[PDB]
């Protein structure tokens, strides 16, 4: 894992790119107001201040994600388990990615193979974060011209625990990267050459969360066609 230092330096630039997206909005609307003081009514001004507050919240979160990363590398993150219904947990996650998936005309689907009161002893916030990460990547890495772009959550329970699959007809993942995509800061060359927004952190965070539950995450995909992400979480003790 030497070449890891070459990854961390490409990440610095990627951090500036995504941090300056909400900053654009903030400095934008703020200048809009500061100039159009007469023209603006004091009720659209409210609408404008709202989005500044919300956008400064978004970049607070992007920083929080950086901390939670270094909270896992430094190895101190606590996992607060409880009994949750995964059916409504993933439904909440599917509903959270609605507007993002709509934009790029990606269909979000949830399918359960086993009757739906599926309960498990897991961290409700941390598992959601895993779902969102995978779901997002599903949308983020969809094919250029594929008639119907979709992301599919398949929820099943078997093999001594619960099994979650996140399927997409997307750009697929090459063989040499099938393992390395879970490394910190690792992005597949394609993401770099085709200017895809990203950090290389999502999956590294995701993996550590899954394995802190004593579970496992892997990927089965072929470069042209479809990517499937497998998340397994054990149930009994």
């Amino acid at each position: 894992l030497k070449r890891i230092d070459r990854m961390k330096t490409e990440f610095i630039a990627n951090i500036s790119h995504e941090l300056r997206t909400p900053l654009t909005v903030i400095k934008g609307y703020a200048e809009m107001i500061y100039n159009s003081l007469g023209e603006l009514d004091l009720s659209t001004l409210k609408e404008f201040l709202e989005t500044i507050i919300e956008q400064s919240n978004h970049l607070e979160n992007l920083l929080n994600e950086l901390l939670d990363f270094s909270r896992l590398e430094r190895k101190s993150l606590q996992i607060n388990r409880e009994k949750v219904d995964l059916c409504d947990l993933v439904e909440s996650a599917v509903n959270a990615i609605k507007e993002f998936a709509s934009s790029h005309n990606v269909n979000v689907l949830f399918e359960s193979n086993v009757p739906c009161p599926v309960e498990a002893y897991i961290d409700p916030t941390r598992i959601r974060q895993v779902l969102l990460n995978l779901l997002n990547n599903g949308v983020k890495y969809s094919k250029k011209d594929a008639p119907d772009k979709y992301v599919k959550v398949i929820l099943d329970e078997k093999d001594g625990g619960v099994l979650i699959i996140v399927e997409d007809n997307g750009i697929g993942i090459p063989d040499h990267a099938k393992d390395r995509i879970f490394e910190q800061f690792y992005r597949v060359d394609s993401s770099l050459t085709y200017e895809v927004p990203g950090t290389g952190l999502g999956l590294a965070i995701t993996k550590e969360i899954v394995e802190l539950h004593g579970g496992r995450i892997w990927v089965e995909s072929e470069v042209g066609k479809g990517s499937r992400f497998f998340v397994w979480i054990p149930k009994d003790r």
Binding site: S16, S103, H104, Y141, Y194, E195, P197
Partner: protein
């Protein structure tokens, strides 16, 4: 009222840029990625394209390149509006027919000045 194709993957940016553009009386058509953009170009010709670079599905450079290889598209003025710092990126975009390149974050007034300059040429 002129028509503008706004291409960017951030809704907040689109919503913001749309407000400044519509304030000057222009009609705005939004596209959230490179492919969406090209689909909308096939069934109408806008007076201006405001173009982001880093997007899912299709990036801005790909768009810039695909605009060039068509006669009806390569004459449409393009402002590249990107969160990318580079002088290589600016130079590349210009060589692919982009008129102006503006770094994010930017001044909405100076943006408006530059939009008007290209619509009155």
């Amino acid at each position: 009222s002129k028509k503008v194709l706004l291409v960017d993957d951030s809704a907040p940016i689109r919503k913001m840029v749309s407000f400044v553009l519509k304030k000057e009386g222009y009609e705005v058509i939004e596209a959230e990625n490179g492919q969406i953009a090209l689909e909308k170009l096939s069934e109408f010709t806008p007076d201006l394209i405001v173009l982001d670079i880093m997007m899912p599905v299709m990036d801005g450079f790909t768009v810039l390149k695909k605009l060039q290889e068509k006669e009806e598209w390569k004459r449409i003025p393009v402002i590249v509006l990107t969160a990318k710092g580079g002088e290589e990126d600016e130079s590349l975009a210009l060589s692919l027919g982009a008129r102006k390149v503006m770094r994010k974050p930017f001044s909405p007034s100076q943006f408006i000045e530059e939009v008007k300059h290209l619509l009155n040429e």
